[PDB]
């Protein structure tokens, strides 16, 4: 088979960039607009993101028990869940000082990654293959909640994609 290293390198570059943008945008926002008491109330109350229908392992042992195709499929559904909702972070990202943060630029990144994950599942050919991507609901807590969920979901994708890379590519992580 044609070597997969180039595709994994390119898919990982975009996943890391989405993860970095989500983390830095959440941090800036929280530091500027959210006093510590509103933070505690927000974080004490049970962050059930619109993507909670997609089953996402959250510790090392459970994640590594999943197959390559399951981890790519979950990544695919997380990315697709943000294609429409990301336009609701338009004002967040325009007011941001993070270089590269705009909903257009983020939308472009997600679409590019969704097609790369689909090519990777083709090369490596259960409810998770049956279900579809998640749908989002209907101001500053609404933006904070959204940013919280975007950070989380991009975090998952970057991790799940790295795991598949390390197991599928020759000497990618420890040569």
């Amino acid at each position: 088979t044609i070597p997969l290293s180039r595709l994994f390198d390119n898919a990982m570059l975009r996943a890391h960039r989405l993860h970095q943008l989500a983390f830095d945008t959440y941090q800036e926002f929280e530091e500027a607009y959210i006093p510590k008491e509103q933070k505690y109330s927000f974080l004490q109350n049970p962050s059930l993101c619109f993507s909670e229908s997609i089953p996402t392992p959250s510790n090392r042992e459970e994640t590594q028990q999943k197959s390559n195709l399951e981890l790519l499929r979950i990544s695919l559904l997380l990315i697709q869940s943000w294609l429409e909702p990301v336009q609701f972070l338009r004002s967040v990202f325009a007011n941001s000082l993070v270089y590269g943060a705009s909903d257009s630029n983020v939308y472009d990144l997600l679409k590019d990654l969704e097609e790369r994950i689909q090519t990777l599942m083709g090369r490596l050919t259960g409810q998770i293959f049956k279900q579809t991507y998640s749908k989002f609901d209907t101001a500053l807590l609404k933006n904070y909640g959204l940013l919280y969920c975007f950070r989380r979901d991009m975090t998952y994708v970057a991790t799940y994609l790295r795991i598949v890379q390390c197991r599928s590519v020759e000497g990618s992580c420890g040569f």
Binding site: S58, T63, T155, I163, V164, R167
Partner: protein, 191 residues
């Protein structure tokens, strides 16, 4: 009056929280999965709580509260990836890089290993490293930009002087740098 100093996860799999020194001070925590008392007050030392891998999950928010006999004295909320601070690299060593026998200067290559508790090989963690070095008589350290590998050159050292090098790590894009490795001393041959 007692207050939290910090919380840290060394490898994204376990974590511990620490506080400064009425009645005994207790720790209570809540995570989406309400309030329970610290599961282990001994493993991470004095005025600490230790949370093993059965209590630790990424992406979900944790809130902790320090309490006395009169009420709540401190509170913190965090996610595990915000508190990751990796252990330092170990087994530092150097060797000559340039092939000259008469220079007044020399280039070296420094190498190390990732901390043993980090899961790099199966993709659970991805690290970056920042190396520092200076002449042993200097008070300030020169700081290199961070790299992805476990080795790097250091250029143009005077063969007449002794140098020392230290390295620290961080998880890419999250948490903070951890502590520095033990120092490695560099003494170059000279004639």
């Amino acid at each position: 009056e007692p207050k939290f100093t910090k919380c840290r996860s060394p490898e994204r799999e376990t974590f511990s929280c620490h506080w400064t020194d009425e009645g005994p001070i207790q720790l209570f925590y809540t995570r989406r999965n309400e309030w329970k008392e610290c599961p282990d007050y001994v493993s991470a030392g004095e005025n600490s709580c230790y949370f093993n891998s059965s209590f630790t999950s990424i992406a979900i928010p944790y809130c902790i509260k320090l309490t006395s006999n009169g009420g709540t004295v401190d509170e913190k909320c965090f996610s595990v990836d915000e508190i990751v601070q990796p252990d330092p690299p170990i087994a530092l060593n150097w060797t000559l890089l340039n092939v000259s026998l008469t220079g007044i200067h020399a280039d070296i290559q420094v190498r190390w290993e990732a901390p043993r508790n980090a899961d790099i090989q199966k993709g659970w963690m991805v690290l970056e490293y920042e190396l520092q070095y200076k002449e042993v008589n200097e008070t300030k350290w020169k700081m290199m930009d961070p790299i992805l590998t476990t080795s790097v050159p250091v250029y143009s050292l005077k063969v007449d002087k002794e140098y020392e090098v230290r390295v620290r790590s961080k998880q890419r894009n999250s948490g903070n740098y951890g502590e520095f490795s033990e120092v490695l001393y560099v003494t170059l041959p000279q004639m």
